[PDB]
Structures are given as C-alpha cells and as structure tokens.
Design a protein around this nucleic acid. Structure first.
Ligand SMILES: [Mg+2]
Ligand SMILES: [Mg+2]
Ligand SMILES: [Mg+2]
Ligand SMILES: [Mg+2]
Ligand SMILES: [Mg+2]
Ligand SMILES: [Mg+2]
Ligand SMILES: [Mg+2]
Ligand SMILES: [Mg+2]
Ligand SMILES: [Mg+2]
Lengths: 72, 304, 195, 101, 128, 133, 520, 132, 37
RNA sequence: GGACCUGGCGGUGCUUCAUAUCCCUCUAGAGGAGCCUGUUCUGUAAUCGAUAAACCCCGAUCAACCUCACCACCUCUUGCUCAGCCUAUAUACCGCCAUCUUCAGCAAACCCUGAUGAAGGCUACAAAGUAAGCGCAAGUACCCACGUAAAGACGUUAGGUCAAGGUGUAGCCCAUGAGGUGGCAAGAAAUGGGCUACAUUUUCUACCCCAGAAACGAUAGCCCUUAUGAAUAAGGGUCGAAGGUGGAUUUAG
C-alpha cells in the first residue's frame, strides 16, 4: 500500500522535530507558543510532508514579520 | 423423450469429468461427493437449495410425466383412458374387488404424495373418499397381500422423543463429582456447575446470591427448581453469567441449574420437572420496531 | 448466415488436464465447460434454466479453476522456493526469549484501481519489561511516566504509532522513541527524588 | 455538461473553497487562538471578512451526483434515495439486500 | 447529461402514454396517436457526422488482398450520404403512413360485407 | 504427447542478509457469501497443509448494517423500505512462519482471490533489541 | 488471444488473421483518439502514474531555435528538421551543437526517390564541421536508401580525410566479383574494427546464391568465426543451410548439420539478430525436402517466439504435418487431434492419402467433420478426394450407415451454392461414389439421386456396375423404369440391359422392350 | 401495490428473463448481484466512484454493442484487474464483434488507468425464463 | 466531470459509434418541431 | 314504454362471524396549562406542492448565508451545455407509491346452457365445466415448523408526484433564461402531532434498589459561558407563574 510515494526519502525526525525550523524567535513569547502548537499539530499530521510543513512555517514567518510593527 | 437419455448420458460423462477434476476414482463416487464438489467449485449465497446450483440425475430432476398412453394406431393401452382419472379409477376398482372378495370369504399417505406417485391430480374430497375406502378395508380382516398393499401407501409415523436430554456427570481432582449445564435467555447466557455431595452456599460470578440479587423474586426464581424437586440444602453450585437484565440473568441461571440437576436426579423427576415447565428456553424476545410505527406494535394516532 | 460449431464437450476426454484448460481465474463459459450442472429457481412442472444462458453462474464467483489437483501441483512446485522455519523456535516462551520485541503492522486489500489507503501507516509493538529493564528505579520511573500503555496483568508494555504516513517512518520513529525513553528513564531529577 | 446551473454553482464553490482552504484554516486559527493579541485577532477577522464569497466550506452542499437532489442523499454512495433504490431494486450495485429481519 | 439520459423502451412508454386514465375507462382521447418508431434498426452503427472509414465495421476489412487503413470521408460525399439517409428515412415514413383499403361491404364503418378468409387450419390437419 | 523437454525455472538468489521471521500471520476475510468464504478458507488451509505449516480456523460473528429509506417520492412517511449490508468474517492464523514463505503464500493467495472479498493481514514478527538501549 | 465461445471462435487462418488485425486496428483507433483528445484522459486517477497509459505529446513548442533543435530528436519527423536547418542557416547562420547536427543527419538519413535526393543534396550546406560520425552516417543513409556509388564516394572521401558503417559499405560494394570480395574481406580483417559479425551475416545474405566455390569456403569462414569465438551460429549457419540449396540431396552434409543443430538445440539460445524469423520458415522448408521424422522431432525455453508471422507459422505447421503424414500413423493422428484446435487443403489431402495407405477407414469421417466444422465448405477438391478414397471401401458392412450419413452431409454442402455455378460440375465428377454409398439400407434416396444425375452425365464402368447392383437388389417395374431409360439414353446401359432383360424384365410389357430393340 | 423492477403481468405473450421476472426482494434470496466489488463492505471507501463508473460502463457497453445484447452485464473486479461478462446474439459478424471488443477494452483501459478484460457468450436467440 | 463524460460521448456519436437513443429521440422531435414551426 | 342480464345499494331477511375490532369489558393516552414543531388565517415585495379516510415533524434521514425555486435592486445575451427554462398541463406520461389489502380472487385458451340475448356454468352417495399463467399459499429472512417482517395480483379514487430525473403538447427563446447584494421566513387569533409536568409510585442525594431528607413544575424569559462557523446548539446564575389530571369527543394495543 506504499508501492511508490516514498515522500522523497523524508524522515520521521524531519517531520516531527521542527526546532531547526524554529530559530528566529525567543522561547517565551506568544509567537513561540503559537508556533510550538503549530509544530505539534504538524508532527501529529501524517497527511502532509516536510515540504508542506515548511511552507506553512515560512508563511507564518512572513506574515507575522510584516506584522512585526507591534510585538506586544 | 430421447432428450431424457441424452441428459442421462451427459450427466454420466459430467460426473466422470468431475471425479477426475476433484481427484477421485470415478468408479467409487457418491451424490454427497457431487454436492460437496459443486458447492466448493461454484459457491452461492442463495438461501434456497432449489435456487442454488445443483448437479442431479435427470430422472429426479424432471418430474414424472405420463408416457404416450395410446399406441400409434387406434385403441389406447389402458381401459379407462377415454375418461380422466384412469389410474385412480383402476385402483378403486381393484380395491372394491378385494373388499367384496373378503366379504364373500366372511401412517397415512399425503395427497400430493399420491399425486407424485401417480401422474394425475385430484380433489381433496376424492382423496377423502379414497381414505374412507382404505379405512373401510382395514376395519375388517386383511390378509398379507392386503396389508402389504396398504403399507405400500402408508408411511412412517416418525414419532419424536418427548424427553429431556441428560448431561453426563463428570469428575475432577481430589475425587470431586459434579455436572455442568448451560442456559440462555433474551440477551443473557450463563453456565452452572452443580456438586451433588456439596451443599449450602452458592456462588455467582464469584459473589453470593444473597448480595448479588438485592430483590427477592430473583432468589425465588433461582430457588424454584430446587423447591420442586425438594432437594434444597443438599446441592451447592457455581455459575458464570453474561447478560444485561436482572430477571434475564435470573431465568438463565434457573434454566442452567435445572439442566444440571436433571442429570443427578432420576428421569422420573426430570419428567415431573418437564410437566412443571422449567426445562425449556423462553423463545420470547423483544419484538422488532417497525418503520412506520411508534413501536413494535403501536401505530401513530389515526387522525381521520 | 454463419453457424457456430458444436461445443467442446464431446471433444474433451474424461482424462484431461483441467488445471491446464483453466489455469487462471476466468468466467464459466458453458461452451468450454462440459458439466451439465444447472442453477436457477424452478417453475412448477419445470427445472432450473440450463447452463447455456445461465448468467447467474456468471455473476456468482467462479472457482472451476484452482481444483485440489491444481493446488497440489502448484504447492509441490513452489516448495522448491519455500524455506524452513528454525526448529529451535517451537514455543511462545522460547521465541519471545530469543526476540522479545514484538512488532506488528497490517493493511487491507480491496477491489479497485487505487491501492493506497491511510490505514497502511499504523503499526504497534509490544514487549514485556520483566527481563528488559534490569533495574527498579528506572522501572518505577517508566511505569509512572506511561499512563495506560502498559498491562501488568499480562505484564507487557504495548505502544502504537501512526503519526507518520510511511510504515518505515513509523518504524524508525517508534525505535527512536523507545531508545530515548529508555535513556531518559535511566537518569532522574531532584524534583523526582523529592516525592 | 453538468446537470444544472445550481450544480455548476456548487462546483465553482467547491473549487474556490479548495483553492482557498489553507488560508482559511490558517487565519481562522489565528482568529480563534486565545493568547495572541486581541488587535491581531481583529486584523484576522476583517481579513476573513474581506476574503471573497463562495470561498467558505459552509456554503457548499453535499448534493446528489445524478439527479442534483440536495436533500435525501447518502454520504457514502453520494446518490439520491431514488437512484439508490432504483439501482438496488434492479440489482446493479453489489452486496445490498432487503431487510427481511 | 449522459448519466441523466436513459434507454429507449421506457422513454417510448412515457412518451406514448398507452396507460393511465386516457386508455382506462374507454375515454381514450380525441383521435391523437403517436406511432412507435425504431431508430436503431434504421442506420447502421458505422456512420456519424465525421465519416471515418472503418475497415473493421464500415468498410470491408480486405480489398485486393490488402489490409485497409483509416481514412476520411470528405464533406461532399458526406453530404451525399446524409441526403441519401434523409431520403431513405422519408421513404420509410411514407411506407409506414399510408392508406388502408378494406373492401367496402354494406357501408363504411360497418363490418357486414367483409370476409375474414378461410377458417384456421385444424390441429389434426383440416384444410378449410 | 506434447510434453516440454526443458522446463524454464526462474532464477533465485539467497542474499547475504537473513530472512525475517513472522510470529503470527492472522488474516481476516470479509465477504457476502458464507459459502464463498468456506470455499476460500478450504483452499487456504489446504495450501497451508500441503506446504507444511500450522493452521487455525474460527468464524467471527456476522455484522449487519441496515437503514431506512422512503418508499415513495413526494409525500409518504409512514411507508418506508429498508436495506442491509451484511459482512461475514472468517479468520485464519499461521504461527512460526518464515518471511519468504509468508511472501510467497501471500502473493499466491492474493492472485487467487475471488472478487467479492476483502482481505486484512495482521503480521507479527519478533526481533532482537537495538544497540543504543 | 482469441475468445472462447464457438461463434466468435476463429475457425480458419485467413479469418483469424483478419480478426486480430481488426483488433490491432481498434488499438490504433484508440491511439488516434487518445492523441487527438489528450485532455479527456489527462486525469491521473490511478495512484501509480504510468506514462504507458498517459496520453501521447508530439506538439512543437513556441519558436525557439535551441529548444526546437533539442525537440527535433523528440518529434521524430523531417519537416521540423527542414525548418530548423532553414532557421539556423538563413537568418541565424550558427550551429547549436555538433552533436545536434549529427543527430539531425542521423534522423534525415534514417528517413531518406527525388525526396531522398533532395534530402541528401541539402546536407552538404551543413557547417564545415563534419566529423567521422557525420560522414559514416551519410554513408549509412546513401547505402540503405539510395544507390551505392554515392556511398563509395563518401567512403573514399573519409579515407582521404565503424562496424555497421563498414557493413553497409560492403553491402554497397557487393550488391563473379572474386577479387572485390577477397580484397574487401582482407582489408576489413586487417583493420582493427573487430566487427560484431553482422558484416559476415550481410555478406552471406549477398552470397544467398552461388556455386560450391563459395558454398564450401563458407564452412571454413564459419570455422574461423568459431575459432575467434563470437558467433552463436544463429543466422549465418541457417543462411548457409539455405545456400546448400539442389539437384541431389547431400546426405553427408545433412547428417553433419543435423548434429550441429542438435547441439544448438541442446544448448540454450539468446536472440541477437533481427533475421531469426526467416530462420524458422526456411529451416522447415529445408526440413521438408530432407524428409526425416527424428529430424522433425529435433527441430520441434522461450524459443517459440521466433515463429512470429502467421505466414511463417503456416508454412512450418504445414510442412511439419505433411512430413508426419508421409512418414503406423496412430501417434501422428494423436499429435494431430491434440493440436487441431490450436493449429489451422493440402495438409488434409496428405492426411487423406496417409489414412488410405494406413487403411484406417473409421478415422476419415471424424477428420472430414472437423474440417467442415472449421472452414471446409464451398470447395469440392477434398470432397472428391475423400469420396474416391472411401469408395474405391465396402469392406465394413455396419459402416455403410456412416457412409450414408457422411454422403448426405456432403450433398447438403454440395447443393448449398447455386449462384456461384461451382456446384454444377461437382456431381459430374464425384456423384458416382456418393450414390454408391447411398445405395449401400436406404435405396430410394440413391435411386432419385441417380435420376437427378442423369437428368442434369458422363457414364462410367463403375456407374454401370452401380446400376446393375441396384437393379438386381425383386421389383421388375421399379428396376426397369430406370435401367431401360438409361439404356435408351446411352449404349453401355443398353449392352447391360441385353443381359438384364433375361431374368424377369422382358416378360412384363413389350413397349419398353420395343424401345430397347429399336435403340439396339 | 408497489412498482419496482418488476414486469406487469400480460396475457402471456411477453418473454422475460430470470432477473427481469424476479422481484427486487429476491435479490439475495433468488438472485445474484450483477456487480462484485468490496466498496459496499465495512471500512472500505470509493464506493460512490465504483457505482458511478460501473453505471457509465454499463451504458457505454450497451451503446457500443447495441441490438446484440440480450441481458444485463456482470462486473467482476478482483483487486486491480477488471473483468466484464456479457451475453449477446449472433446477429452481427465476428469481425464487428472483435473490433468493437478491442475498441471498448482499450477505451476502458485508458480511461480508468486499469487493466480491463471482457468476455461475451453468444446465443442464437434470447433465453426466456417465462412468458408473462 | 460530466464535462469530460458528455463531451466524449457527443464526439463519439458524431464519429458514429455510440447509438444514443435519447439524443436520437431528442433531435427527431427537434426536426418535427422545426418542421411544424 | 313492457319484460329481462350484471353490479352497486337497502334505516333488507336467515345463519356464522368480528382476530383489539362492534359493543359490553382491560390498560395507557389526546381534546386542560406551558413548550417544540406543522397547518388555516392576518399583514408583509416575499416560494411551490399534498392539503378526508388514503396530508398536517407531509417532499425535509433539516431553511442562520448555497439549500433559495420568491421578491427589490444591479448586470450578462450563443448564453458550461451542437443553448437553457423549478413555465402551464400528474386530465399526456414513464419512473416511484397511498388505498380496499387486517382482501382472495384475477384469468389468456377451450366446451356447454339459454330457441346460438344481454349473461351463466355450484351440488361428490355428485347434475358441465376443463384450465395455461398471476396472486394467495408454499418456501426464504430473524430465534423454530409458531410469531414478526417481507409479499400482497386484476382494478377504483382522471388519487399524489411535469419541483428527484426525463419526456409528449403548448409557451419564453433581451427571458418566463443566467449571474450577485439584501432581507424574506412575525403572530390579535384557531387547530393538529409530540415533550414536560399538575405528585407523594412524587423531588434531592451515593449506589442502582434494605438509606437519609423535602413536602412539586421552565426544554419558556433575562444575563453570561462555550460548540462549529467567515458571519442555531449544550452548560451556568436569576426569574419559580400557568398548572391541582381534563368540554362534548377521541386514539393505540
Ligand atoms: Mg362513407
Ligand atoms: Mg407498501
Ligand atoms: Mg438558503
Ligand atoms: Mg426560472
Ligand atoms: Mg393522476
Ligand atoms: Mg410489509
Ligand atoms: Mg406470501
Ligand atoms: Mg387528479
Ligand atoms: Mg458559531
């Protein structure tokens, strides 16, 4: 039932451990809270791959970085 | 008509081929083998046997049809042909001849069974008249020929047992005799082991009845078997149960205790218990709910 | 205008390689099959419809192929390829001793063009901690950590994994999780010493 | 050649909701989260309000495939009750029996 | 759509409406009757708008002992064949709808002076 | 009379790696016809016996799901019609079974399926402990 | 590949050919529809993506000289290449790559006749940069599509400046020429090409016909092939077997080649030469001339693919069954009755004469019935043969019923086809034995059949014998109204009637006797 | 009085087939399902796709072998491979039959991206179960 | 997509392979209607 | 106008019956109050259809926006459709069903009686009826052979359904088609089906049955929380009345 579709040789740690994708914010802030919850949900999700997860991450990064005007 | 023999020989060669396929010598081979083979080679979820696939001999496949009863020229063979019911009339004539012969000297067979024995239909009251003739013959003396003539038609009574099965006693370690039995109910199923020499307390799933059944009627029900036989405090029992309803479990354990005690007690007492009516599983179960009805039997209000 | 030749029934002999004439799964084809078996609900003074136009036999599953003889031949042919089980492994205690870590996956198979189905990813594993931990502090620690993944009546810890779509991803993640779990149960903390 | 214009509208709505699905999920999470700023939740809420119509998965309908009947449709087979009964009576589909229970 | 479409027999039934109150009670209707027709019998399966020449079904497979190949029917002979089919359908409809001439007996709409021909032959064989 | 001389046998290679050993192959077949299931399980158990491996058989309960639809089109709620999907289970367990035997037997059965059947394998293989632990 | 039901069952070689050709035509129609409307099947519903099922794309992209040149070798045609050469030479005047020019020349030489002349004279404008590959591919094209002087000029030019290049050059030189062949072989072996022996195969193809002075040297050339140890002896061996063709069979060389091909069969084969299809057919052609049964059995893993075309398969099976018939024949008819459904007039004629020499009379009916069931209809050659062979016999008395039955079936087939006019001359040739067999139980049928025959004649001695036996086998008037009429018709029936009238015929009435006297 | 997949009783001059005479409450009791797949069983999916595609296939085959068929189709999907079974009349020629067989087989294969095969049984005249 | 389905079937009837009884009825009554105005 | 055939009807006779159906009888309910949800009616620019038995939690196993088919406003004109139309016609129809049916008759094809009339065809210790086939029945499903389901023909209500879908006829085919914003869907009132209780067999508490207290009732309203959603539901605080077991009548077993 997986004859093909190897997910480009992806790895479970690449799916779950997103701490390397999480570098550009401290350990305490609400953005940290939200992005930690996001990484949790993504690791729980098997349907999507590391590609989709990193696109999600980059989208969040872009949006709250153009909303960096507040940081409150 | 040759079609029949053609089908017969086709069936023979097909039986040979089928024996070859299933891997058995074609000489030794049986209808049971035919049935099992066709079932394995062409299964079908059809419920009716007549609808399921069957490989059968043509003689019993086709119903018996009356062959040509008149020759190719002129007269017919039998002497009642110009009227119907020729075989029945000839049989009645022979019967009446035997009756008057005996006069000067001095179970039953179903209608459709007689029909399929013959090649003719008839009426219910005609059948009744034939039965009247037979019983009139039998009210008087009858020789060996007459008895065998009548028993050609008469069939086996096929009487039932009208008896309660006896479960076998058993023995286990440290020389302990006992007997196990099983009972069921609406949705509860249980099984109980009775020790004949033991007596006193009783267990239910590892709990005594006094505190497992807070209500009194359940204990009354499970006591009712012992009370009827009158052996009350001379038998201890264990039992396991699985069910939803309290009274359901009660009836299940009652039936199981009875089916265990009938083994120890005499068959006379078992017959007495059957007459009492505590040795039969209740066939009654919650009726289904219908789609248009508010319940299994109650309809919506007829509004008019 | 054109006329069809009579069937192969009279042509086929009583001694015949039925496994060869029906090697694989195929329809009934009464023209090829000589058996006069019929199937159908009979009418009063009637019989089931003959095998020729009997599409009931067609719609039902087909098992004329794969007779016991064909099965025998295929099995004795494939025995050349089949291997032997280790005779030393002949009991549950012995096999669980030789290889305590039990692991089991599964997958359905269904008719259709597609074959992927998400349930292929799930897998689980089992192991008894009676012989694996070799200590007591880490044992109490691990049994305090795990909430319901154990069963002391059976004396086995069992764990599932489905977080990954791939079976091999699931396997590797389960192995890494077990390893890190053992390594973290090995040590302790001061708030854990204070209880 | 869809059955009717309402089926056409349903298909357009399905495609729009699909191609805007990720954004709806992300900004709806950003809205329904609690610890983040109220002003940011408001930003996200007017963003969703400015999002286009026929993009939400609530406007679509699990309509029938053959007869375009919205009501009385089985989710598993997706067919209307009438077509399902037709096929079952004629024995076209598989493994369905009348409830003689 | 293709799925919404359906076969011909039930279509003709619903279109003609031989059943219902009309036919029942003997009320009928005021001398309007659609006659059944069969379109599948008329045209052979091969031809369509775009006339690909089919060696398998439309053209004989072999000519001069040589396998044929798919080709195009140009618009001129396409229109020719279409006009031929139109004329053929017109002739069919003409032959269908025509007069009926039962010999005039005592009067029109009367079954008096008409003969039904000889009686039917008997089972044993009796030529009447 | 036509009997081939040289029977073409496919090539086989015993790779240096060891074969995996499955503890229990438990297959569960869902069908609509208990007779078809009986024939299928007879086939399977006969093949397993001939190959020389263990076998177990038991019949789990029949599951049914029934549902109500409207009998008519426009306005009739009292009058309905019902339907039911019946699935029948059959189980077969095989213990102490080598990996290659598992593979070959599974492909054999998978090619020998009938149509109206679904087949669910649960494989159980034992292995030794990792090195990091 | 063929269906199972009897109606669709192809029951003859030509109709089966037409049938699977119609199937292939449907396959081509499918290809056409898919490559005409790809967007319909564009959906990749199947989880495993398969380009074999994906629609096919021969669509030139937008104007892009470099990408267009890269797409040249993808589109596989010549108009694109002409247009690309135009765009690169007229306005651009530059080459995208020497490899691209080489591939263009490859395609144009493969595609090639004034069109070939133009394509070959439009390649000299190509940029000066023309390496060996270019020159030898030009040689390939000019050989395999045009005359040979151009290839020779190109080879001389290359010398002034590959295996199958020199192969094509040798083909061109060859296609009496003793010194030519010799110097060619010598310098070819001198060069360090080390061919794949396809040069040798081609020179054999050219030596298809020659006397012993090149047939026998082929044996030592093959021994040299073996010494160098390259050839599997798959095609050149068979070609020399064919070159052996012949006023007198050569039994010694025949036995030698028998042993050779015996070890070749014993060992396993692998295909290397595209011409292994004529191998089968011409090998069996030589086998038919040889006439040996152990030989046929020897000629009989997956080596059955080399039969291929239905024509070669037909020739092979025909010659095979012919040799088997003209070899007891119980094993032969066993093999036959085994392969008849799988297998497909001349073969049946040989079968009939084999059954005749065997004297197995009881078998011919079933064979005729099988032929009729398959395709034996609307032709009376084999009917005449079977009738003559079966009524030369009368020795089985009980089999006269089967005689009558097969005769009735033969007549049912004979009288089918009036419109064709071919059934008119069939009774004149073969009605005699048919009517004799009908006479041999039922007699009135044969009586009225001889009536129809004589009222269509060509009398015959066995026809006289038939008339005599029929007349003698009780009814004077019934015999007279036939024999007297045939006597008044022709003279030999009259000289027979002279004796027939002695027993009881002349006493009945004198008017017919008077007619006989007048005719006599 | 219910009207569902059952033929009205006529004077006795309506030839009818087995399934067409039998009622839709005889499906499992005295009939078989024309199609065979596993989407109907529990746990599976794609059943709607199976049904729509098999209906489309039935219509397409009825219209690409028109006037020759005399019964409904039988569909048999064993895993990947799809098999069809039909009953036809010997009206048209084997040329026609084989050509359209190959045509429709290729069409189904390229449409469903699935291995497809079909078989057809010839009959001189439609087999009648009863006269209704 | 009924788009794909119906487009393919229409093109194939134009080729003249699928005898669409429903479309035949429809366009026959269309001819009759345009004849009778 | 006289006499007849068949059916219906009889507040028409005799006999046998009525299974939860006629009554006498048995139980529990509806018509009392509130609430939920339909219907009639009022008004609104604001769908449609059924609307005695055989409709009134009916199309709907669902209407906050599509569902939406109405309406106001604003746009498209070969318009996804080799166009389209939820436009009229269920009194053209198919397809699908209520009904007597909690029936047992319907019958092609033959013969006979009536002077060869419509029509009829029963006597078993037997006098002209024979019968294909359908249905009943039988068998199958659930747990049996009973029971329940299922089945339940011919026909009646021109019964319902052109709005599941298609189609005959007649129409719009710059529209009576198509697209996007908005609200539309309330009750001075009457009625129907269901829920809640009007009590102490009750109410609360732990347990589901050996106890202890009270001597009730909101699924309505106000406020709040949360559920999904871009924009009705469950829970919590307050409110603690009507209500005192039903007006002729009527429902189910
Ligand atoms: Mg007049
Ligand atoms: Mg009903
Ligand atoms: Mg809406
Ligand atoms: Mg409109
Ligand atoms: Mg009506
Ligand atoms: Mg019912
Ligand atoms: Mg019944
Ligand atoms: Mg009406
Ligand atoms: Mg919300």
């Amino acid at each position: 039932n997986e004859a093909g579709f190897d997910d480009d040789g992806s790895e479970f740690h690449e799916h779950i451990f997103l701490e390397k994708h999480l570098e550009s914010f401290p350990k305490q802030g609400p953005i940290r809270h939200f992005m930690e919850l996001v990484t949790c949900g993504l690791s729980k999700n098997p349907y999507l791959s590391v590609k989709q997860k990193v696109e999600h991450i980059e989208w969040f990064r872009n949006y709250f970085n153009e909303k960096k005007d507040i940081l409150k | 008509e040759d079609f029949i023999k053609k089908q017969i020989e086709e069936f023979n060669i097909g039986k040979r081929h089928l024996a070859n396929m299933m891997g058995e010598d074609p000489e030794t081979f049986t209808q049971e083998d035919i049935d099992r083979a066709i079932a394995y080679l062409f299964p079908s979820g059809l419920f009716e046997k007549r609808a399921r696939p069957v490989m059968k001999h043509p003689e019993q496949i086709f119903p018996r049809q009356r062959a040509i009863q008149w020759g190719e020229d002129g007269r017919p063979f039998h002497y009642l042909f110009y009227t119907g019911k020729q075989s029945y009339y000839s049989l009645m004539h022979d019967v009446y001849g035997m009756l008057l012969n005996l006069e000067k000297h001095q179970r039953w067979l179903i209608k459709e069974e007689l029909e399929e024995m013959l090649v003719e239909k008839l009426s219910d009251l005609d059948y009744m008249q034939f039965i009247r003739l037979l019983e009139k013959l039998l009210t008087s003396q009858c020789g060996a020929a007459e008895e065998e003539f009548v028993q050609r038609f008469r069939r086996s009574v096929t009487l039932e047992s009208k008896k309660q099965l006896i479960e076998p006693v058993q023995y286990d370690e440290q020389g302990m005799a006992f007997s196990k039995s099983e009972g069921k109910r609406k949705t509860a199923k249980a099984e109980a082991i009775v020790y004949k020499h033991g007596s006193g307390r009783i267990k239910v799933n590892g709990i005594d009845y006094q505190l497992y059944f807070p209500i009194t009627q359940d204990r009354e029900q499970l006591m009712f078997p012992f009370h009827f036989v009158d052996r009350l405090g001379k038998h201890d029992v264990t039992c396991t149960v699985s069910g939803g309803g309290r009274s359901a479990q009660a009836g299940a354990i009652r039936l199981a205790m009875a089916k265990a005690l009938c083994s120890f007690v005499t068959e006379d007492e078992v017959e007495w218990m059957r007459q009492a009516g505590l040795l039969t599983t209740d066939p009654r179960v919650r009726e289904r709910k219908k789609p248009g009805q508010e319940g299994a039997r109650r309809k919506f209000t007829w509004k008019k | 205008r054109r006329k069809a030749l009579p069937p192969r029934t009279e042509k086929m002999a009583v001694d015949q390689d039925w496994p060869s004439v029906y090697p694989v799964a195929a329809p009934f084809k009464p023209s090829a099959v000589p058996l006069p078996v019929r199937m159908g609900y009979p009418v009063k003074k009637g019989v089931p419809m003959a095998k020729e136009g009997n599409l009931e036999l067609l719609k039902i599953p087909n098992f004329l192929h794969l007779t016991p003889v064909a099965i025998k031949k295929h099995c004795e042919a494939l025995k050349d390829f089949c291997t032997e089980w280790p005779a030393a492994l002949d009991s549950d205690e012995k096999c669980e001793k030789h290889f305590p870590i039990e692991i089991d996956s599964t997958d359905y198979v269904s008719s259709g063009p597609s074959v992927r189905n998400p349930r292929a990813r799930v897998v689980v594993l089992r192991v008894k901690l009676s012989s694996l931990n070799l200590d007591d502090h880490a044992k109490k620690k691990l049994i305090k950590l795990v909430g319901e993944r154990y069963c002391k009546t059976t004396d086995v810890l069992t764990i599932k994994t489905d977080r990954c779509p791939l079976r091999r991803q699931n396997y590797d993640y389960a192995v890494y999780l077990l390893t890190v779990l053992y390594h973290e149960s090995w040590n302790t903390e001061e708030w854990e010493k204070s209880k | 050649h869809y059955v009717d214009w309402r089926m056409w509208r349903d298909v357009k709505r399905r495609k729009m909701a699909y191609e805007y699905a990720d954004e709806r999920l992300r900004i709806n999470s950003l809205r329904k989260n609690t610890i983040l700023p109220k002003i940011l939740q408001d930003v996200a809420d007017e963003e969703i309000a400015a999002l286009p119509r026929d993009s939400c998965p609530v406007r679509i309908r699990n309509r029938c495939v053959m007869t375009s009947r919205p009501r009385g449709v089985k989710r598993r087979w997706r067919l209307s009750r009438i077509v399902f009964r037709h096929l079952a009576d004629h024995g076209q589909l598989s493994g369905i029996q009348r409830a003689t229970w | 759509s293709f799925f919404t479409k359906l076969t011909a027999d039930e279509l003709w039934k619903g279109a003609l409406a031989e059943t219902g109150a009309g036919a029942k009670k003997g009320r009928g209707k005021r001398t309007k009757k659609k006659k059944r027709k069969d379109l599948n019998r008329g045209q052979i399966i091969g031809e369509g708008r775009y006339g690909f020449l089919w060696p398998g079904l439309n053209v004989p497979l072999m000519k001069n002992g040589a396998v044929q190949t798919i080709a195009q029917r140009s618009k001129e002979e396409q229109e020719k064949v279409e006009a031929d089919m139109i004329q053929q359908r017109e002739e069919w409809d003409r032959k269908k709808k025509m007069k009926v001439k039962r010999e005039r007996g005592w009067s029109g709409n009367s079954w008096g002076g008409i003969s039904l021909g000889p009686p039917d032959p008997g089972p044993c064989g009796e030529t009447y | 009379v036509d009997v081939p001389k040289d029977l073409t046998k496919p090539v086989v290679t015993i790779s240096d790696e060891p074969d995996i050993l499955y503890k229990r192959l438990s297959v569960l077949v869902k069908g609509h016809d208990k007779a078809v299931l009986d024939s299928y399980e007879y086939f399977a158990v006969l093949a397993a016996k001939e190959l020389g491996i263990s076998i177990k058989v038991h019949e789990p309960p029949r599951k049914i799901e029934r549902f109500t639809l409207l009998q008519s089109v426009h306005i009739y709620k009292k009058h309905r019609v019902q339907y039911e999907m019946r699935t029948l289970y059959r189980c077969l367990e095989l213990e102490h079974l080598t990996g290659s035997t598992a593979d070959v037997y599974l492909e054999y059965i998978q090619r020998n399926l009938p149509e109206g059947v679904a087949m669910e394998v649960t494989k159980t293989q034992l292995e030794q402990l990792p090195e990091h632990i | 590949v063929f269906q199972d039901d009897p109606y669709l069952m192809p029951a003859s070689s030509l109709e089966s050919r037409s049938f699977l050709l119609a199937k292939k035509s449907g396959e081509n129609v499918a290809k056409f529809i898919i490559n005409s409307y790809p967007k319909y099947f564009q959906k990749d519903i199947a989880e495993p993506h398969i380009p074999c099922l994906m629609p096919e794309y021969f669509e030139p992209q937008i104007k892009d000289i470099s990408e267009a040149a890269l797409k040249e070798r993808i589109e596989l045609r010549k108009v694109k290449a002409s247009v690309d050469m135009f765009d690169q030479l007229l306005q651009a005047g530059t080459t995208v790559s020497l490899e691209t020019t080489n591939s263009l020349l490859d395609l144009l030489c493969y595609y090639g006749t004034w069109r070939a002349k133009n394509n070959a004279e439009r390649i000299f404008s190509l940029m000066p940069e023309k390496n060996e590959h270019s020159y030898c591919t030009m040689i390939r094209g000019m050989v395999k599509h045009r005359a040979y002087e151009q290839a020779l000029n190109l080879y001389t030019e290359l010398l002034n400046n590959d295996v199958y290049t020199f192969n094509a050059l040798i083909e061109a030189t060859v296609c009496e020429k003793w010194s030519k062949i010799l110097e060619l072989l010598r310098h070819m072996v001198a060069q360090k090409v080390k061919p794949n022996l396809q040069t040798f195969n081609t020179i054999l193809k050219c030596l298809r016909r020659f006397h012993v002075f090149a047939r026998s040297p082929a044996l030592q050339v093959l021994r040299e092939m073996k010494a160098i140890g390259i050839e599997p002896s798959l095609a050149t061996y068979h070609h020399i077997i064919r070159l052996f063709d012949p006023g007198d069979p050569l039994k010694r060389s025949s036995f030698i080649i028998y042993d050779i091909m015996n070890e070749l069969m014993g060992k396993r084969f692998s295909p290397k030469d595209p011409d292994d299809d004529k191998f089968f057919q011409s090998a069996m052609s030589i086998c038919s001339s040889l006439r040996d049964l152990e030989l046929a059995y020897q000629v009989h893993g997956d080596n059955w693919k080399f039969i291929g075309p239905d024509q070669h398969r037909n020739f092979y099976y025909s010659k095979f069954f012919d040799l088997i018939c003209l070899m007891q024949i119980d094993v032969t008819l066993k093999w036959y009755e085994d392969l008849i459904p799988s297998a497909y007039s001349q073969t049946m004629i040989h079968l009939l004469q084999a059954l005749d020499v065997a004297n197995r009379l009881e078998v011919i009916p079933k064979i005729w019935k099988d032929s009729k069931e398959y395709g034996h209809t609307f032709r009376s050659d084999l009917r005449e043969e079977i009738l003559m062979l079966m009524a030369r016999d009368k020795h089985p008395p009980e089999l006269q019923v089967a005689f009558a039955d097969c005769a009735a079936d033969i007549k049912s087939a004979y009288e089918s086809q009036p419109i064709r006019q071919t059934a008119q001359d069939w009774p004149a040739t073969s009605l005699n034995c048919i009517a004799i067999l009908f006479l041999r139980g039922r007699t009135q049928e044969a009586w009225k059949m001889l009536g129809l025959f004589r009222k269509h004649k060509i009398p015959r001695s066995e026809l006289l014998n038939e008339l005599m036996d029929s007349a003698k086998v009780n009814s004077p008037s019934q015999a007279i109204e036939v024999v007297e009429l045939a006597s008044a018709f022709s003279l030999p029936i009259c000289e027979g009637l002279t004796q027939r009238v002695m027993s009881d015929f002349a006493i009945n009435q004198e008017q017919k006797e008077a007619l006989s006297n007048l005719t006599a | 009085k219910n009207r569902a997949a059952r033929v009205r009783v006529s004077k006795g001059d309506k030839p009818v087939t087995y399934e067409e005479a039998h009622a839709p409450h005889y499906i499992a009791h005295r009939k078989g399902w024309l199609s065979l797949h596993t989407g109907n069983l529990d746990g599976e999916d794609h059943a709607a796709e199976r049904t729509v595609e098999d209906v489309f296939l039935r219509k397409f085959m009825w219209g690409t072998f028109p006037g020759c068929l005399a019964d409904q189709l039988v569909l048999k999907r064993r895993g990947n491979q799809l098999e069809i079974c039909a009953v036809v009349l010997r009206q048209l020629s084997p040329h026609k039959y084989y050509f359209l067989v190959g045509y429709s087989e290729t069409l189904l294969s390229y449409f469903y991206k699935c291995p497809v095969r079909l078989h057809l049984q010839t009959v001189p005249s439609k087999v009648v179960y009863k006269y209704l | 997509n009924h788009h794909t389905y119906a487009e393919l079937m229409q093109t194939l009837r134009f080729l003249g392979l699928y005898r669409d009884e429903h479309q035949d009825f429809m366009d026959e009554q269309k001819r009759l209607k345009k004849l009778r105005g």
